RNA sequence: UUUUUUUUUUU
RNA sequence: UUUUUU
RNA sequence: UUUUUUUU
């Protein structure tokens, strides 16, 4: 069997011995959680309530509680996301190439096809915030159905419905096609949000920060403080571990009273 | 030196990560919580009722689509609700005095604290089906266990290069049930390596 | 040799019956629900 | 003993039990009684569901008696 | 998508969501050209039949 | 009001006395009478007229299938009413074609009725209709919560004097039984002994919560299901009736407008009837 | 079909439709109003009661 | 550390 | 036996 | 809101 440890029995926190130090005697000190970085997402109350009427007015929030339960609904993220959207789609915006080259660029920037949820950016049937007005992309529409439909639609939907604003702007998309258009007044508005860039800005709030030697030292304790991966695992039986806490309930208070008993009595008879 | 404006490059991989002296810096992180507990308790009762009323019209999959819940998550809501109600109607014991491990006790405290700060969720926010996306899930994701290699080296040429050797599936033994009786359970051992089926 | 099944597996399926698709019939409400797959404008 | 176990699995014909089958005369009548009792018990529980009461007292000391199925 | 369609057909026939039953529609059929798709569709049918008709209600042996 | 709480102001009445929850009626047998149940079924059957009828299937009759018998003890079919509707005889609508057609229709309807419950079991409210009520239920309850919060100070201050009349009286008896007399005690300690700071704070907190716990409708241990059970069941009775008489009681002499409002006011009658304490 | 993209603020999540269930419309309405608040939502409070 | 399950990557 | 407290 | 924090 394996009993007591045969070795240095170095501490989990990684501190040295000696006088005027946290640790005095050599030991493991596995129970000492104070030295270990832990969050505080709860709340603490006061020791005395001066108010006459019993009320929970002593409850206070913790500093780490605000960041422990965030919400992706704050207003100051949409503005930043919109700006990054324009800078992320610049490769295809200034790509004065054919449809084959433009399509490939958009595919890498946003994976989308059959059986996948795409953002709809770049598709002919989508509204985009273009710098200047431009006509829709009516190149993909059939020519046989539009020509036969232009006569049956009538004057109501041939010169006042869509053609009244189909050539108001000088610029156009995919060349020009005055013959082929959409007589019906179907507005292709609305869009969809991205799943890659949106998830990055949302998580940005979790990494924000608010005779001396030239070069600052790097104590070992620092490493183990935050990181929990490099820390030795527990080996003692759970039963013993749990019993240690119970022992301290009545032991600890006695030590505090024993110290002040001598100091207080000395002053009452000599001082 | 090179142009590649995308979000799956070597430098862009694992965005918002400490690379340098900031690794040792302490940082607070959000506390995870299961979806089946963040939903409004009120809605849980409603969902359970439907399930128990008409399983045919209200199937496990159809019920979760309206409220945006996964097939696995919705199953736990009915199971956890059932037991809570059973002990109350029968006058056996109160939920608060119920015996349970310490792992669940801490979870209950987080659930109450989650709503006290933000509030309960009226409707779940999760996708029913998965989607193939580039994400970092552990250290076993960015590794090839078949060829046992990290760096792929290939010849640079415009002409068609010969393809690589495809892997074969691993044949393992399995078991099936043929006859089941209250006093006996018969099973069959399948051996895919046997040439003769018979 | 240990990649594909032999001739024994193929022969067994012929006898077991594994080598108009579906019909959901409800007496009183719905006549029949046939899922036959074929050409429409053939 | 090996034959009996294999018989239930359907691999081989079921072997006869001890003393044969023709002598099994009293067991046939006894088995019918057990089967009849099971069917009769079913009829009893039918009525319960209509007025299921988790808590049922009695006219002795107002004692509580819980009911649970399995 | 397959499960949606199949599941929807059955309800129409029975007219569950109707205060006043008006039996007019008593014939629903599905036609698919693709062999692959056809096969898949069949599978869906099977699942639909389960949990609806009392003659095809399965139950695990341990709980049965 | 109770004699103990006789000092309650006008501004604090509705708090301790929760109103009777709008139109919350239940259908469970725990709060129903023989007379009421009979009346409700009668009111439904009165739509038509008949004298002669035939037995029903859902009544023993050499039961052989697990379809037409008592269902499993689910928390949707435990309340009393449909056991008194299924076994009901097949009523008529009121020579040669006048009788042959009437019989044929009834016989045909019989078979469909039988299988109505065989496949499906929920033919009441629609998906949106079910959800509609739910929305409103939450909304109405949210209001009460808001009120409480606003009136926090009022409630707490009120309860302070409540505990004074109980702690002082209760402590007086305890000292008399335990102690001997309070005549030789210091006057300064007389007030503290009768109203200690421990019991006063503990009783006030317990009494403060007493006033709370209103709106017991959305109660976890079977408090939500009660509304749903009583809501959905309404539609089921109507449907059942119609099934029996599909094409034998009306000659299609009304449009959709009349039919839509015909079943509107009908429900009103039922709710009043069942929801009554005479 | 793409050109110079101008940054524009949109709220695809809060977009009522003719196919959404009644419960979804209700749930989204309350959530939208909470994020638009500029007096309570965008504030930090230490104590729970207004002390 | 799973009520009605003898099933469950429970954590 | 006390203190705190959705 | 439960003999909750609280510990043979």
Q: If DSSP states are collapsed to H, E and C, what string results for chain A?
A: CCCCCCCCCCCCCCCCCCCCCCCCCCCCCCCCCCCCCCCCCCEECCCCCCCCCCCCCCCEECCCHHHHCCCCCCCCCHHHHHHHHHHHCHHHHCCCCCHHHHHHHHHHHCCCCCCCCCCCCCCCCCCCCECCCCCCCCCCCCHHHHHHHHHHHCHHHCCCCCCCCCCCCCCCCCCCCCCCCCCCCCCCCCCCCCCCHHHHHHHHHHHCCCCCCCCCCCCHHHHHHHCCCCCCCCCCCHHHHHHHHHHHHHHHHHHHHHHHHHHHHHHHHCC
Residue F238 dihedral angles phi and psi, to the nearest 5°: -60, -50
Give dist(CA A100, CA A105) in Å, integer.
9
Residue A229: closest C-alpha in chain B: B24
Contact between B48 and B60 under an 8 Å Cβ cutoff? The reply is no
User: Residue with CA nearest H3 C1'?
Assistant: B83
Any CB–CB contact under 8 A between B123 and chain G? yes
Q: Does an H or E element contain B181, and which?
A: strand B174-181
Structure tokens at D56: 């049922």
Residue G30: closest C-alpha in chain F: F139
Q: Kind of pairing, strands A60-61 and A43-44? A: antiparallel
Listed in sequence order, the residues at least 6 apart from F173 whose beta carbon sits closer than 8 Å to its beta carbon are none
In order, the DSSP letters of B12-29 are TSS-S---SGGGGS----
User: F247-270 burial string, b = 16+ CB within 10 Å, else e?
Assistant: ebeeeeeeeeeeeeeeeeeeeeeb
Give dist(CA A268, CA A270) in Å, integer.
6
Residues of B with CB under 8 A from a CB of A: 5-7, 15-16, 23-31, 109-110, 113-114, 117-118, 131, 133
Q: Give contacts of F 18-77 with D, CB under 8 A.
A: 29, 69-73
CB-based burial label for B189 (10 Å; 0-12, 13-18, 19+): exposed
Q: Give the single-character DSSP code of C14.
A: H
Nearest to F51 by CA among F83, F17, F93: F93
Contact between A24 and A11 under an 8 Å Cβ cutoff? The reply is no
Give dist(CA A112, CA F40) in Å, integer.
59
Do G23 and F127 lie within an 8 Å CB cutoff?
no
In order, the DSSP letters of B137-166 are -SSSSSSBTTTTBSS------SSPPPPPPP
Residues in A 55-84 whose C-beta is less than 7 A from nucleic strand I are 55-59
Contact between B48 and B78 under an 8 Å Cβ cutoff? The reply is yes
Residues in A 225-264 whose C-beta is less than 7 A from nucleic strand J are 245-246, 249
Contact between A224 and A14 under an 8 Å Cβ cutoff? The reply is yes
Nearest to B19 by CA among B28, B30, B10: B10
Q: Is E3 helix (H, G, I), strand (E, B) or coil?
A: helix
Contact between F117 and F239 under an 8 Å Cβ cutoff? The reply is no
Give the count of Cβ contacts less than 8 A between chain C and E: 60
In order, the DSSP letters of chain F are --STTTT--GGGHHHHS----TT----SGGG--HHHHHHHHHHHHTTS--S-EE--SSS-SS--STTSSPPP--TTS-SSGGGGTTTS-EE----THHHHHHHHHHHHHHHHHHHHHHH----SS-HHHHHHHHHHHHHHHHHHHHHHHHTHHHHHHHHHHHHHHHHHHHHHHHHHHHSS-SSSS-HHHHHHHHS-HHHHHHHHHHHHHHT-----TT-TTTTSHHHHHHHHHHHHHHHHHHHHSSSSS--S---HHHHHHHHHHHHHHHHHHHS---
Do B57 and E16 lie within an 8 Å CB cutoff?
yes
Q: How far apart are the first and last CA of chain E?
A: 33
Distance F195 CA to I5 C1' (A): 22
How many angstroms separate the Cα of B88 from the Cα of each of B94, B97, D49, F227? Answer: 7, 12, 19, 19
3-state per-residue secondary structure call for A231-250: CCCCCCCHHHHHHHHHHHHH
Do D8 and B92 lie within an 8 Å CB cutoff?
no
Distance F17 CA to H2 C1' (A): 42
Number of H helices, E strands in chain G: 1, 0
Do E31 and C38 lie within an 8 Å CB cutoff?
yes
Q: Does an H or E element contain G46, and which?
A: none
How many angstroms separate the Cα of B110 from the Cα of each of B30, B34, B149, E36? Answer: 12, 11, 43, 49
Chains that touch C (3 or more CB pairs under 8 A): B, E, F
Listed in sequence order, the residues at least 6 apart from A206 whose beta carbon sits closer than 8 Å to its beta carbon are A67, A70, B16, B27, B28, B29, B30
Contact between F203 and F166 under an 8 Å Cβ cutoff? The reply is yes
Protein-covered nucleotides of chain J (CB closer than 7 Å) are 1-2, 4, 7-8
Protein-covered nucleotides of chain I (CB closer than 7 Å) are 1-6
* Identity of the residue in E28, E33, E45 whose CB atom sits nearest the CB atom of C22: E45
Strand J at less than 7 A from CB of F201:
no
Helix axes F225-244, F127-150, angle to 10 degrees: 150
Strand I at less than 7 A from CB of F201:
yes
Give dist(CA F98, CA F100) in Å, integer.
6
Tell me which residue has tokens 């009695």.
Answer: D58
Residue C30: closest C-alpha in chain F: F112
Structure tokens at B35: 């979806």
Any CB–CB contact under 8 A between B62 and chain E? yes
Structure tokens at A189: 């508005």
Distance F199 CA to J5 C1' (A): 19
Nearest to A9 by CA among A29, A33, A24: A29
Indicate the length of chain C as a whole number: 42
Nearest to C35 by CA among E12, E13, E42: E42
Q: Is B38 helix (H, G, I), strand (E, B) or coil?
A: helix
Q: Give the single-character DSSP code of E50.
A: T
Q: Is B169 helix (H, G, I), strand (E, B) or coil?
A: coil
- Which nucleotide is nearest, taking the CA of residue F212 and each C1'? J1
Strand I at less than 7 A from CB of A46:
yes
Give dist(CA B57, CA F120) in Å, integer.
8
Do F119 and E21 lie within an 8 Å CB cutoff?
no
Give dist(CA E52, CA B58) in Å, integer.
11
Tell me which residue has tokens 């044949």.
Answer: B171
CB-based burial label for A34 (10 Å; 0-12, 13-18, 19+): exposed
How many angstroms separate the Cα of F226 from the Cα of each of A157, A250, C32, F27, F230? Answer: 56, 52, 39, 8, 6
Residue F158: closest C-alpha in chain A: A53
Q: Is B120 helix (H, G, I), strand (E, B) or coil?
A: coil
Distance of CA F9 to the CA centre of its chain: 31
CA atoms within 13 A on the CB side of F162: 25
User: Residue with CA nearest J7 C1'?
Assistant: A246
Method: cryo-EM
The angle subtended at Cα A257 by Cα A251 and Cα A263, nearest 5°, is 145
The residues with which B186 forms a beta bridge, in sequence order, are B179
Contact between B161 and B182 under an 8 Å Cβ cutoff? The reply is no
Residue F63, sorted as left (phi over 0), alpha (psi -120 to 50) or beta, turns out to be: beta
Nearest to F200 by CA among C13, A209, A54, A168: A54
Do A82 and G7 lie within an 8 Å CB cutoff?
yes
Q: Does an H or E element contain C7, and which?
A: helix C7-16
Contact between D8 and D17 under an 8 Å Cβ cutoff? The reply is no
Nearest to A135 by CA among A173, A162, A104: A173
C-beta atoms surrounding C19 within 10 Å: 9
Q: Is B58 helix (H, G, I), strand (E, B) or coil?
A: coil
Q: Is B67 helix (H, G, I), strand (E, B) or coil?
A: coil
CA dihedral A155, A159, A163, A164 (to 10 degrees): -150
The angle subtended at Cα D52 by Cα D49 and Cα D54, nearest 5°, is 145
Q: Which residues of F touch E16 (CB under 8 A)?
A: 120, 122-123
- Which nucleotide is nearest, taking the CA of residue B83 and each C1'? H3
Nearest to A179 by CA among A143, A209, A206, A210: A143
Give dist(CA A105, CA B6) in Å, integer.
10
Q: Is D55 helix (H, G, I), strand (E, B) or coil?
A: strand
Nearest to A135 by CA among A190, A92, A178: A178
Any CB–CB contact under 8 A between D56 and chain F? no
> What distance in Å separates residue D46's CA from the closest CA in chain F?
7
Q: Where are the alpha helices (DSSP H) in E1-64?
A: 2-14, 35-49
Contact between A182 and A162 under an 8 Å Cβ cutoff? The reply is yes
Contact between E32 and E41 under an 8 Å Cβ cutoff? The reply is yes
> What distance in Å separates residue F204's CA from the closest CA in chain A?
7
Q: Give the single-character DSSP code of B57.
A: T
How many angstroms separate the Cα of A64 from the Cα of each of A59, A61, F102, F118? Answer: 15, 9, 78, 58
Strand H at less than 7 A from CB of B185:
yes
Contact between E59 and B180 under an 8 Å Cβ cutoff? The reply is no
Do E30 and C31 lie within an 8 Å CB cutoff?
no
Q: Does B have 3 or more CB contacts under 8 Å with A? A: yes
* Identity of the residue in F76, F120, F138 whose CB atom sits nearest the CB atom of B42: F138
Any CB–CB contact under 8 A between C29 and chain F? yes
Give dist(CA F167, CA F201) in Å, integer.
10
Contact between A92 and G2 under an 8 Å Cβ cutoff? The reply is yes
Contact between B128 and B71 under an 8 Å Cβ cutoff? The reply is yes
Q: Does C have 3 or more CB contacts under 8 Å with A? A: no
Give dist(CA F230, CA F23) in Å, integer.
11
User: Residue with CA nearest H7 C1'?
Assistant: E62
Listed in sequence order, the residues at least 6 apart from A106 whose beta carbon sits closer than 8 Å to its beta carbon are A92, A121, A122, G2
Q: Which residues of F touch G21 (CB under 8 A)?
A: 127-128, 131
Q: Give the single-character DSSP code of G7.
A: P
Do E7 and B57 lie within an 8 Å CB cutoff?
no
C-beta atoms surrounding F179 within 10 Å: 10
Q: Is D25 helix (H, G, I), strand (E, B) or coil?
A: coil
Chains that touch G (3 or more CB pairs under 8 A): A, B, F
- For testing contact with chain B, the best of E12, E14, E52 (most B CBs within 10 A): E52
Q: How far apart are the first and last CA of chain F?
A: 22
Strand H at less than 7 A from CB of E58:
no
């Amino acid at each position: 069997p394996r009993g007591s440890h045969r070795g240095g029995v170095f501490p989990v926190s990684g501190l040295t011995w000696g006088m005027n130090r946290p640790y005095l005697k050599r030991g493991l000190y596995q129970h000492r959680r104070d030295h270990i970085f832990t969050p505080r997402w709860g709340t603490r109350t006061a020791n005395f309530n001066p108010s006459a009427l019993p009320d929970g007015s002593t409850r206070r929030w913790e500093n780490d509680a605000f960041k422990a339960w965030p919400l992706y609904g704050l207003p100051h993220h949409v503005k930043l996301y919109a700006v990054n959207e324009a800078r992320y789609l610049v490769p295809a915006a200034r790509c004065t190439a054919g449809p084959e080259i433009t399509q490939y660029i958009l595919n890498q920037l946003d994976p989308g096809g059959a059986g996948r949820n795409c953002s709809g950016i770049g598709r002919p049937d989508v509204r985009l915030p273009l710098a200047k007005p431009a006509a829709p992309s009516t190149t993909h529409l059939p020519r046989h159905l539009v020509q036969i439909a232009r006569h049956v639609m009538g004057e109501a939907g041939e010169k006042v419905r869509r053609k009244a604003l189909s050539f108001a702007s000088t610029l156009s998309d995919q060349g020009f096609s005055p013959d082929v258009f959409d007589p019906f007044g179907t507005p292709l508005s609305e869009r969809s949000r991205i799943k890659r860039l949106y998830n990055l800005v949302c998580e940005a709030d979790s990494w924000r920060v608010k005779k001396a030697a030239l070069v600052r030292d790097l104590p070992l304790a620092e490493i183990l403080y935050s990181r929990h991966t490099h820390r030795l695992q527990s080996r003692r039986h759970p039963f013993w571990i749990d019993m240690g806490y119970k022992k301290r309930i009545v032991r600890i208070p006695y030590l505090y009273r024993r110290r002040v008993a001598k100091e207080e009595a000395q002053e009452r008879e000599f001082g | 030196q090179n142009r590649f404006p995308v979000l799956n490059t070597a430098e862009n991989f694992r965005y918002w990560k400490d690379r340098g002296l900031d690794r040792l810096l302490p940082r607070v992180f959000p506390l995870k919580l299961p979806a089946h507990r963040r939903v409004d308790p009120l809605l849980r009762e409603y969902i359970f009722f439907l399930h128990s009323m008409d399983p045919a019209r209200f199937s496990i999959r159809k019920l979760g689509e309206r409220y945006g819940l996964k097939e696995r998550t919705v199953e736990l809501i009915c199971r956890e609700f059932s037991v809570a109600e059973f002990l109350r109607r029968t006058e056996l014991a109160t939920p608060y005095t119920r015996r349970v491990s310490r792992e669940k006790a801490v979870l209950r405290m987080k659930e109450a604290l989650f709503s006290l700060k933000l509030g309960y969720d009226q409707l779940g926010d999760e996708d029913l089906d998965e989607q193939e996306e580039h994400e970092f899930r552990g250290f076993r994701s960015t590794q090839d266990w078949i060829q046992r290699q990290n760096i792929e080296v290939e010849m640079m040429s415009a002409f068609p290069l010969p393809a690589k050797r495809n892997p074969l599936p691993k044949r393992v033994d399995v078991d099936v049930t043929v006859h089941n009786t209250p006093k006996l359970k018969v099973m069959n051992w399948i051996d895919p390596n046997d040439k003769v089926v018979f | 040799d240990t990649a594909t099944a032999g001739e024994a597996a193929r022969a067994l399926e012929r006898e077991l019956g594994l080598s108009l698709l579906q019909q959901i019939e409800l007496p009183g409400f719905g006549e029949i629900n046939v899922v036959h797959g074929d050409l429409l404008s053939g | 003993k090996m034959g009996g176990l294999l018989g239930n699995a359907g691999l081989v014909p079921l072997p006869p039990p001890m003393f044969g089958w023709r002598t099994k005369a009293r067991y046939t009548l006894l088995e019918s009684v057990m089967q009849k009792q099971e069917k009769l018990r079913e009829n009893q529980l039918r009525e319960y569901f209509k007025t299921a009461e988790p808590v049922v007292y009695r006219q002795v000391s107002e004692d509580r008696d819980d009911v649970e199925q399995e | 998508a397959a499960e949606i369609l199949v599941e929807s057909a059955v309800e129409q026939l029975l007219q569950v969501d109707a205060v006043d039953p008006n039996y007019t529609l008593r014939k629903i059929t599905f036609v698919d050209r693709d062999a692959t798709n056809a096969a898949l569709l069949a599978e869906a049918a099977q699942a639909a039949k389960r949990a609806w008709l009392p003659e095809h209600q399965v139950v695990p042996a341990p709980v049965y | 009001l109770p004699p103990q709480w006789w000092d309650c102001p006008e501004a604090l009445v509705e708090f301790l006395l929760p109103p009777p929850v709008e139109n919350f009626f239940s259908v469970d047998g725990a709060d129903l009478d023989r007379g009421r149940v009979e009346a409700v079924i009668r009111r439904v059957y009165t739509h038509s007229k008949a004298d002669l009828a035939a037995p029903a299937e859902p009544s023993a009759w050499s039961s052989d299938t697990a379809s037409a018998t008592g269902d499993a003890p689910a928390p949707w079919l435990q309340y009393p009413e449909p056991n008194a509707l299924w076994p009901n005889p097949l009523l008529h609508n009121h020579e040669a074609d006048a009788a042959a057609l009437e019989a044929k229709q009834l016989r045909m309807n019989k078979h469909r009725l039988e299988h109505l419950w065989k496949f499906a079991r929920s033919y009441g409210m629609s998906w949106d209709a079910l959800d509609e009520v739910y929305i409103r239920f939450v909304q109405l309850k949210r209001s009460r919560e808001a009120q409480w919060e606003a009136k926090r100070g009022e409630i707490l201050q009120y309860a302070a004097v409540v505990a004074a009349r109980e702690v002082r009286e209760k402590r007086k008896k305890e000292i008399e039984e335990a102690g001997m007399d309070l005549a030789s005690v210091q006057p300064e300690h007389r007030e503290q002994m009768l109203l200690p700071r421990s019991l006063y704070r503990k009783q006030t907190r317990r009494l403060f919560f007493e006033w709370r716990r209103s709106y017991l409708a959305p109660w976890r241990p079977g408090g939500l299901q009660k509304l749903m059970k009583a809501v959905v069941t309404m539609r089921m009775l109507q449907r059942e009736t119609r099934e029996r008489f599909l094409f034998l009681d009306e000659e299609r002499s009304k449009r959709r407008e009349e039919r839509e409002e015909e079943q509107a006011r009908l429900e009103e009658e039922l709710v009043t009837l069942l929801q009554r304490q005479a | 079909a793409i050109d110079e993209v101008i940054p524009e603020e949109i709220r695809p999540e809060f977009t009522p439709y003719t196919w959404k269930s009644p419960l979804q419309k209700w749930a989204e309405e309350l959530k939208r109003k909470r994020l638009t608040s500029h007096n309570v939502y965008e504030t930090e409070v230490f104590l729970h009661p207004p002390a």
